[PDB]
């Protein structure tokens with residue numbers, strides 16, 4: 001890539017988080033995932049004392065289009081100041097003389113939250129699953145305070161580390177693989193007004209958060225499984241996702257608030273953290 005062709009403010013932001021190529025070993029044989037535009041590898045990052053850091057290394061598959069390269073770098077820069085225990089952080093960006101720039105992320109042992117809760121070899125309790133939802137709300141409360149709108153909040157895009165801490169993220173692996181849940185947009189997670197206008201706000205992130213809570217309470221069931229990505233007509237008939245069998249009544253009430261037909265009337269993520277903290281606290285385990 002020719003750095004001189006990129007936006008100079010973007011390049012300057014990249015240089016503030018640059019990783020020198022000799023500090024990063026990309027394990028090209030160890031693929032975490034691959035889609036149409038991107039690929040993710042395991043990597044080893046060496047810090048100044050020689051400590052080895054297990055990381056995920058994201059690359060583009062092609063670097064010929066300046067728009068794609070700029071957008072890819074911009075995605076990394078957007079997260080460089082995210083500093084919160086429930087938001088994925090950026091280790092840095094490795095610029096190489098040949099090939100794609102590399103976006104370097106701390107490695108998340110348990111992958112994405114959706115596949116984690118779907119894995120029958122794990123046995124999270126109802127309280128544990130509510131806790132995951134509380135952690136997402138805390139990360140979203142932080143992001144909303146920065147006026148950041150996520151636009152694709154869903155269990156598939158959040159990560160889980162080795163301590164089972166949820167990191168809100170925009171993994172986008174299913175998106176980049178053209179997963180069925182994206183239609184032309186993640187319509188089964190979208191607020192009614194975004195289905196109609198394709199505009200997104202923090203209050204439409206709240207709608208998506210309600211769907212994510214439903215994902216947690218069903219251990220990763222697909223929402224509206226007998227509805228094709230028809231969802232706008234379906235909702236306007238007067239419908240919502242049904243209450244999962246093990247979803248507490250107050251948490252379903254929270255879901256229905258998240259899906260209020262008026263975006264202005266949906267609870268803030270600050271309110272959601274408070275309410276879900278209380279519900280979580282009623283469980284012994």
Ligand SMILES: O=C(Nc1ccc(F)cc1)C1(C(=O)Nc2ccc(Oc3ccnc(Nc4ccccc4)n3)c(F)c2)CC1
Pocket residue numbers: 032033040055056057058075076079082087088103105106107108109110111112143150159168169170171172
């Ligand atoms: O998240 C992003 N932006 C953002 C962040 C916060 C936020 F609030 C809003 C948006 C971006 C991004 O590229 N994310 C990304 C997320 C995970 C990735 O894969 C990772 C990473 C770390 N460990 C694993 N492990 C793993 C293990 C087993 C199975 C599967 C995965 N995969 C990856 F390569 C990239 C656009 C920049």
